Design a protein around this ligand. Structure first.
Ligand SMILES: OC[C@H]1O[C@H](O[C@@H]2[C@H](O)[C@@H](O)O[C@H](CO)[C@H]2O)[C@@H](O)[C@@H](O)[C@@H]1O
Ligand SMILES: OC[C@H]1O[C@H](O[C@H]2[C@@H](O)[C@H](O)[C@@H](CO)O[C@@H]2O)[C@@H](O)[C@@H](O)[C@@H]1O
Length: 341
């Protein structure tokens, strides 16, 4: 009843800084997005951070070993066995440092780490192959590196930005630059966004091993509408694909995207999280992803948050629930998922 689940993947962000470690409050300070249809910047002061909520751990650094210890203890409380790490191909010493610290901290608690491959500049199947080789070579022998039946696993955000004819070269067994049957073979999980008429042939022709949905906001896409999950799972099973639906506790991003209020999803003291997690389990899936551990900008985090009012903003909080409620409610749902496996 307390063991970690290694079919539960929680999306984790390593881009936060503090004065203590980095010399700068990175990401707590953030540009405000212009409306797609001179917006300014959130300064990352104690009073004004780039979130509608306020972390229990304050304006922390993702490179602070003491913060990382606490985060791994939170994963243990939630029973979430896999940390799905955002990866932007920064190619700098700070990226390399933080990945190594995260792997070391995870292994102390028997947590595993996989990579979430983001839409970095000029991403294409050739530099993706080179980067998959780099990550497996650098980190594949670390004891915390995740494998499922011998294979690493990668999530690919906004995979539709690359044509299926390009994906086939990397992911078909006959592809020109294939990883299949090589030392670098891996489970590749693409993003299902829109309707089945578009997504079914995309996923088949790209040769993905499976698909996920990402968005914590119900109805944002066809794929993030949970009443579609039973039929998506049936299609996955008939076609030998792994479906990993994404569940989250709520959504609100209006500090950084003030024009995006129609995407707000209220937490209702945990009832929103309960409804989404129940739908994933009832669909009969073999793996679940959680959006998110700590995407504070988008208000999808399960990490503990505290009440806070400053001279500049009155933050949202988890009241009438306690700061660790979303960790303990995740553990409840992991138990119900395991009962169904
Ligand atoms: O939310 C601000 C954040 O947006 C973009 O990153 C995305 C978000 O973190 C979220 O939607 O999840 C995506 C998948 O993990 C991720 O791409 C970036 O523009 C980022 O720079 C920005 O801070
Ligand atoms: O516009 C804000 C929005 O940006 C991102 O979503 C975009 C894209 O990445 C998604 O694939 C499609 C799905 O239809 O929607 C947008 O174009 C996300 O960061 C999202 O959370 C955010 O609200």
């Amino acid at each position: 009843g307390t063991e970690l689940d290694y079919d539960t993947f929680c999306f984790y962000y390593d881009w936060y800084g503090s004065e203590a470690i980095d010399g700068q409050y990175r990401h707590w300070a953030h540009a405000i997005a212009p409306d797609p249809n001179n917006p300014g910047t959130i300064p990352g002061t104690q009073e004004s951070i780039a979130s509608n909520f306020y972390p229990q751990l304050g304006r922390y650094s993702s490179s602070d070993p003491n913060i990382l210890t606490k985060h791994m203890d939170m994963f243990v409380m939630a029973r979430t066995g896999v940390l799905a790490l955002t990866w932007w191909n920064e190619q700098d010493e700070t990226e390399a440092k933080r990945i190594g610290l995260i792997l070391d901290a995870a292994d102390k608690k028997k947590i595993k780490v996989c990579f979430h491959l983001e839409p970095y500049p000029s991403r294409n199947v050739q530099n993706l192959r080179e980067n998959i080789v780099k990550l497996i070579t650098r980190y594949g022998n670390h004891p915390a590196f995740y494998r499922k039946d011998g294979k690493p696993l990668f999530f690919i955000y906004d995979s539709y930005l690359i044509e299926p004819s390009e994906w086939e070269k990397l992911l078909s067994p006959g592809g020109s630059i294939t990883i299949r049957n090589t030392a670098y073979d891996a489970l590749m999980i693409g993003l299902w966004t829109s309707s089945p008429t578009v997504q079914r042939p995309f996923i088949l022709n790209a040769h993905f091993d499976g698909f996920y949905t990402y968005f914590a906001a119900t109805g944002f896409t066809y794929g993030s509408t949970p009443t579609n999950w039973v039929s998506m799972q049936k299609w996955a099973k008939e076609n030998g694909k792994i479906f990993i639906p994404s569940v989250g506790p709520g959504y609100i991003d209006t500090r950084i995207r003030p024009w995006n209020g129609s995407v707000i999803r209220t937490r209702t003291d945990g009832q929103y999280y309960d409804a989404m997690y129940r739908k994933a389990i009832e669909a009969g899936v073999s793996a679940i992803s959680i959006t998110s551990f700590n995407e504070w900008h988008e208000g999808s985090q399960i990490e503990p948050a505290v009440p806070y009012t400053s001279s500049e903003f009155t933050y949202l909080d988890y009241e009438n629930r306690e700061p660790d409620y979303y960790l303990t409610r995740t553990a409840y749902w992991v138990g119900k998922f395991r009962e169904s496996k």
